[PDB]
Amino acid sequence: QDQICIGYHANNSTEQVDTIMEKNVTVTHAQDILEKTHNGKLCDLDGVKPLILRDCSVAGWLLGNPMCDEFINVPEWSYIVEKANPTNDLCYPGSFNDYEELKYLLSRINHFEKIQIIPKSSWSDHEASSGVSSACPYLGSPSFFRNVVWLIKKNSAYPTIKKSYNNTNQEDLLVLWGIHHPNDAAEQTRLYQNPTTYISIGTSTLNQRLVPKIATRSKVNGLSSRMEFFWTILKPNDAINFESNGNFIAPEYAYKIVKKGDSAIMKSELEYGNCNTKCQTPMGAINSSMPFHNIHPLTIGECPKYVKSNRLVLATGLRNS
Amino acid sequence: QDQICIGYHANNSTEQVDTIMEKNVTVTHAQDILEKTHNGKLCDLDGVKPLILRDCSVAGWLLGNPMCDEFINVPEWSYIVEKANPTNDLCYPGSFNDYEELKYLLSRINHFEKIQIIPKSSWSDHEASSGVSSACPYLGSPSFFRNVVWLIKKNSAYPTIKKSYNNTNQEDLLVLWGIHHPNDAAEQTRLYQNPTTYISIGTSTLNQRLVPKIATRSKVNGLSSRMEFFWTILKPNDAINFESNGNFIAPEYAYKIVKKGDSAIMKSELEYGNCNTKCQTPMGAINSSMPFHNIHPLTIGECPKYVKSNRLVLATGLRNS
Amino acid sequence: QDQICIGYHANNSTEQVDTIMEKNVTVTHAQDILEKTHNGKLCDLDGVKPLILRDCSVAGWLLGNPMCDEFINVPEWSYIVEKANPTNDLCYPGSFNDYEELKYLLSRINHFEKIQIIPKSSWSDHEASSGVSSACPYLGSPSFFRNVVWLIKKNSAYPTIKKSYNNTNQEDLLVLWGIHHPNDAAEQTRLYQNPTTYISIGTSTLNQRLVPKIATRSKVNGLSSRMEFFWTILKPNDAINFESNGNFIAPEYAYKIVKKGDSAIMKSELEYGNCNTKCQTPMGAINSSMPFHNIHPLTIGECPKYVKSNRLVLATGLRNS
Amino acid sequence: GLFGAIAGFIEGGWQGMVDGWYGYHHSNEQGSGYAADKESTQKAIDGVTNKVNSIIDKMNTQFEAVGREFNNLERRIENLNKKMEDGFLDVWTYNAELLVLMENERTLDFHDSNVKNLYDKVRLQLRDNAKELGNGCFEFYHKCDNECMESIRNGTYNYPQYSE
Amino acid sequence: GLFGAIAGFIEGGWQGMVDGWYGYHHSNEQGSGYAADKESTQKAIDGVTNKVNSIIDKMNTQFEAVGREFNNLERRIENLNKKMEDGFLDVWTYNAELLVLMENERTLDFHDSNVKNLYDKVRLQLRDNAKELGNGCFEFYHKCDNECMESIRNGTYNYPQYSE
Amino acid sequence: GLFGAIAGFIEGGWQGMVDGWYGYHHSNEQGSGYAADKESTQKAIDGVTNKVNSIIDKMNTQFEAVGREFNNLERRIENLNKKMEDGFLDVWTYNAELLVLMENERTLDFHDSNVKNLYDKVRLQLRDNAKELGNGCFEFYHKCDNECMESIRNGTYNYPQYSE
Numbered sequence A, B, C: 001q002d003q004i005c006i007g008y009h010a011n012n013s014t015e016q017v018d019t020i021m022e023k024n025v026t027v028t029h030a031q032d033i034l035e036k037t038h039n040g041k042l043c044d045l046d047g048v049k050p051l052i053l054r055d056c057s058v059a060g061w062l063l064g065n066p067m068c069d070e071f072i073n074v075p076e077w078s079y080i081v082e083k084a085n086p087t088n089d090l091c092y093p094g095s096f097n098d099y100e101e102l103k104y105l106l107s108r109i110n111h112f113e114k115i116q117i118i119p120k121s122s123w124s125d126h127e128a129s130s131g132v133s134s135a136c137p138y139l140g141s142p143s144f145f146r147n148v149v150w151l152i153k154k155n156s157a158y159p160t161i162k163k164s165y166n167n168t169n170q171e172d173l174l175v176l177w178g179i180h181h182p183n184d185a186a187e188q189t190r191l192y193q194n195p196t197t198y199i200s201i202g203t204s205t206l207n208q209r210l211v212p213k214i215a216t217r218s219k220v221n222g223l224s225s226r227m228e229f230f231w232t233i234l235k236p237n238d239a240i241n242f243e244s245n246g247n248f249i250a251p252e253y254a255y256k257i258v259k260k261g262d263s264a265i266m267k268s269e270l271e272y273g274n275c276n277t278k279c280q281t282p283m284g285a286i287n288s289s290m291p292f293h294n295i296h297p298l299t300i301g302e303c304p305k306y307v308k309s310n311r312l313v314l315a316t317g318l319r320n321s
Numbered sequence D, E, F: 001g002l003f004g005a006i007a008g009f010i011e012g013g014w015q016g017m018v019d020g021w022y023g024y025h026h027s028n029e030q031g032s033g034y035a036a037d038k039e040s041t042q043k044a045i046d047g048v049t050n051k052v053n054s055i056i057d058k059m060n061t062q063f064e065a066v067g068r069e070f071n072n073l074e075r076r077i078e079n080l081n082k083k084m085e086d087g088f089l090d091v092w093t094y095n096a097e098l099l100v101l102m103e104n105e106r107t108l109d110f111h112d113s114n115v116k117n118l119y120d121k122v123r124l125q126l127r128d129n130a131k132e133l134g135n136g137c138f139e140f141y142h143k144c145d146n147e148c149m150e151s152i153r154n155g156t157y158n159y160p161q162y163s164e
């Protein structure tokens, strides 16, 4: 006869979702909110290209390891990529004060501008072109870190140094220098004449006195000697004052901080792909409209939200027999 | 004929709430659980008045910056208010060891009692009333930090000092002292005769040796010299031992910690209102029965729960056409 | 006549659960998911027995406090138990560099193997069996820390020491040594002849110079002198180099790290029960199928999930009049 | 409406009933009127009062931020400190807002449930003795005096009352 | 089924209805057919669209992990850093998964609610004029032309239509 | 009761039914009795078993606190460490308690749902052949032998069975 019936939609989709009381439930329509794919590349970030340290560390770059000449001048970057174990670091064995604190500063910077603050030619009463070592070779010849100069005596004499540089720029200056720790008293006089030496350094803020440690150590990269490096941020119109009668590894080039900004130091073995992206992870870039992802927690750019899941599916439709 | 009908309440309230599936839904009755108003003042906390450092820093207060005389004696406080950039700090340029660690201790204290542990008059073989500087002026005349005394030579002589103080109180003692770093060897002898000096300090626990750093630095507040300050907590019945042959900035007044307790160091440009409260934020006090608020996360007292929201309304009644 | 009725289960259980809108609701069946009981003992963990420092601290153990002989040799452990205030620590007053950082390393280790790296008999030109003190008594007689030797002069002479040890094992070496800080210049010469002394120490990585601090301090355990101890991890095939002309507290025994692993340092006054467990808390072990517990947050082993609650009951059945 | 009572088969609300959330409206021989069902109005006021207090009690120990400062060479732990305190204050802001969104809904569907359960309280009593109009009202197959309304209004209505 | 409509008294779904989530299926004199109830289909699409967007908006400020490094003598804060970042990324993973599990359910029971509320839309109109088959269908006590179906399909059906 | 079945129109529970959560109670010619509806009892035991296990599985990676110590001049990071571990252990305590409160409720309303869905399983079968007493019971317009009860008890009841 006559009839009327109330029913509901159904279709052919096999997609399943979960609820609290039941898993693997098939539905008519769903929405996956979890991006699970990247391009496996290291891309530019919104058109600004990353700085990919290759087999160089931050220290090798900033100090100017001769094996790191690729980075002598470096344009504005978006983020920095460093390998887990860069082979080019401190060619001359030693240490780098407050290194992780510097690395952190770097994640807050987008561009350095290398400038010569004390030319190697200005040293009239000390030797400046003999500060080289087999530990730091360039094309097979003994060399050294490019941005600092290892001064030694001249005509059997090391007059005490009084050098001063005033930051007359409008940008903060990253200034690096070092001290050399010999292996015995003979080496000390051989390099510097003076047996008992020091290096004082002052700014508005900094007030340090360094004395070299002449002592017996185990050979690293062939040497028992050590080079120990220091740094500071020189604020505009402040000056830095060096006084030393030996073991001084004087600055030559320093870095104007021309662009503070949001940045990062990615640990990744990957290298430069040739691409652009809005979201970059250390294992590859992301291009998605998804609100979530599961690729890597350490990320940079306008990215989805990281989550440890392998599947996250929202149910929009209804049950389906 | 005869009838019976089941219905529900309704009224005139326009108040809206949100749900997951629908926003801006009008209801009969609701409850706002988010306090969004403060009095814009810095009040007493349950009748005990805060300590409002004005243009003085914690260091200026504790060391006794002459521009900070308002705080020479300071009653029990409930919390401490410091400006973001206090203008009265280290009038004589230099530094303050473990300053943030001291600041943290302060948030655990409610009352100091200044006491004279080494009177300025007790120095028989050194000058004690000439330790002043243009950097630290009081009413136009050269002065210095009040709680420590800057000793210099007397009759072209600086005998080595052996001074000792035993904490015979039942309270912990906060004891401050300093070392002076000159700018050249001439200044060193001019102040102290002795060219090579030191300051040793010992307790049960402390065992330090300080040597001044005579070096060239950039002028700050007119000077290239520096004053560097140290502190320790002297426990009841322990003693502190000073030995020095120059550059010693000896203690005179110290602080008995008479009241440990819950406290805070608020950063606020605000100053003393004339009021009382149970809950104080850095931008104003709170008086509410609300379980939540959105005014400031750093808070002190019996306060609501901080939340970043701008609206939080619970639905008690029902839907309203 | 004829009837059919639909109803539901009911029974005699008085157990209650909570909901958002209603507390203390009785139900037919429930499930408590909160383990609230321990055995009040310190057990073995899966058959491997803990190391229970008794009245000895980590420092007393590792340095070899004579009152700590119980731990001269110590088998593989599962976790370490230390009292809140061990009475046997630094018998000779002083300090222990980077102690908490060492304690943390320990929570990453399961077994040390004590080995003699410099025998006490090898010191031909210094005294090695007179380095004892009343501060460190053994059975009533003056003694010292067992793992290090306090060298003094011999025939009114202290030749400068050049000692070197190469880690020829395949395991990392924990190596401890110290410096002695005298109380006056007389004591310095009485022990070491030389008035001005130092201790240099080098590895691949370490490059330190220590000078003793001769100064007046308050008596602790009867003495004004201090012993200050240092440590390092010696990596396989690296060597450690000591040079000193006084105040050197030389190593004798060191610790091969034979078993890295997951571990812990429990703070507990409890001592060895005689039992085994899968989950150990500082106030007692746990044996449960419960998914949660409320006994103590700091835990080790396959344990339930810690939660601050006192009751957590899930409703499986239904309402019960 | 999840149960479909409120704003479903019942088009709107009764302004004239200023006596509670749920009730009635009759119109017999002796006039019209309103009466608040003090029964279901109580199991409802008990509901939201406990709900509000539970939402508040679940969050009395939340997360307090304390002030810590760091120097120019402690930028790492300073950032750690910053993000760790921002961290907890974000999750608790999430927890508050999310609990409100979720319980505002279970609140509205709770009033819908009660109405659906009151229309069924009456419907499961006046079986043949009335006709379900379907707009929320019933029409009797007999006359219902002001003492007949009360028996329904308190739970026990007598079936012996003829038909058509 | 929490309301029992979907997969309860209605055994399955209508493949032939490719016009929406809820609808009808008649069979009168002038043939059979399907028609999507654009009414309840809209209050449903409004539901899940707002639901998806709310789930996403509730978690746009979540927790970002930044890279910090530590030396060989900073193993304590390094571990603190590690576990604190693992900490937040665990709770937010919990928050996401748990919100999905809970709202997938309130989603399914929402479609069950709507069907239960549509069967009751028709049932509360064709009181005596039809017999509830109980499998989801009704059978008329009169003939129902293609203009009779439409009056039910938009909310106002006329009762004056005789019986048996 | 959100669906109003349990403790609503059905005043209480049947102690005599020790065979499951939902069931029946008949009284025909051949005597009385109880029978557990193994059907809905299974879709219910499946419910809470998965629910318990989901609550547990959602929180197996929670937050572990490890022991770290700090000296007298590390009071800042010590406090950071303290509050950061107290922090996570607070939110997870919140997460546990809150999930229990919320799912205990959806548990009770789930049993209410099933009863409401069983009374409707029978009601949508014995349309005219019985009268809904309204207290949870039905009364037949014919006699119902012990083989008549079984047909209802497993889903297919035959309508051809006369009236009054």
Ligand SMILES: CC(=O)N[C@H]1[C@H]([C@H](O)[C@H](O)CO)O[C@@](OC[C@H]2O[C@@H](O)[C@H](O)[C@@H](O)[C@H]2O)(C(=O)O)C[C@@H]1O
Residues within 6 Å of the ligand: A130, A131, A132, A133, A134, A135, A142, A152, A182, A187, A191, A222, A223, A225
């Ligand atoms: C500026 C200078 O003197 N460079 C030397 C360098 C330094 O003298 C030395 O590094 C001190 O720090 O010495 C170098 O030769 C080192 C060479 O010496 C042998 O005795 C040793 O056995 C070899 O392994 C090797 O170290 C050097 O190259 O670093 C030479 C350099 O000219």
Ligand SMILES: CC(=O)N[C@H]1[C@H]([C@H](O)[C@H](O)CO)O[C@@](OC[C@H]2O[C@@H](O)[C@H](O)[C@@H](O)[C@H]2O)(C(=O)O)C[C@@H]1O
Residues within 6 Å of the ligand: B130, B131, B132, B133, B134, B135, B142, B152, B182, B187, B191, B222, B223, B225
């Ligand atoms: C105790 C004492 O000697 N106070 C002196 C102070 C100290 O000598 C000085 O600070 C060393 O630390 O010197 C002060 O005068 C400084 C004055 O000196 C000029 O040469 C300089 O060009 C000026 O800018 C100014 O620094 C001082 O006031 O601090 C005087 C004080 O009496």
Ligand SMILES: CC(=O)N[C@H]1[C@H]([C@H](O)[C@H](O)CO)O[C@@](OC[C@H]2O[C@@H](O)[C@H](O)[C@@H](O)[C@H]2O)(C(=O)O)C[C@@H]1O
Residues within 6 Å of the ligand: C130, C131, C132, C133, C134, C135, C142, C152, C182, C187, C191, C222, C223, C225
């Ligand atoms: C190696 C050695 O010389 N051991 C001495 C020890 C040291 O000389 C001393 O610790 C220096 O660090 O001295 C001890 O006797 C100390 C004894 O001296 C009195 O003057 C003092 O008043 C007493 O309280 C007490 O300290 C010692 O036992 O430590 C003796 C030891 O032989």
Ligand SMILES: *[C@@H]1O[C@H](CO)[C@@H](O)[C@H](O)[C@H]1NC(C)=O
Residues within 6 Å of the ligand: A166, A167, A168, A237, A238, A239, B218, B219
């Ligand atoms: C640096 O140069 C400017 C301008 O010549 C000068 O005023 C300033 O004092 C200098 N800085 C220092 C610390 O000498």
Ligand SMILES: *[C@@H]1O[C@H](CO)[C@@H](O)[C@H](O)[C@H]1NC(C)=O
Residues within 6 Å of the ligand: B166, B167, B168, B237, B238, B239, C218, C219
């Ligand atoms: C301080 O004084 C008390 C009592 O005079 C004395 O016993 C104690 O040893 C003193 N403290 C020190 C370290 O000298």
Ligand SMILES: *[C@@H]1O[C@H](CO)[C@@H](O)[C@H](O)[C@H]1NC(C)=O
Residues within 6 Å of the ligand: A218, A219, C166, C167, C168, C237, C238, C239
């Ligand atoms: C330790 O011994 C090995 C083998 O004898 C040697 O090759 C190595 O260089 C030594 N280590 C040092 C640092 O001397």
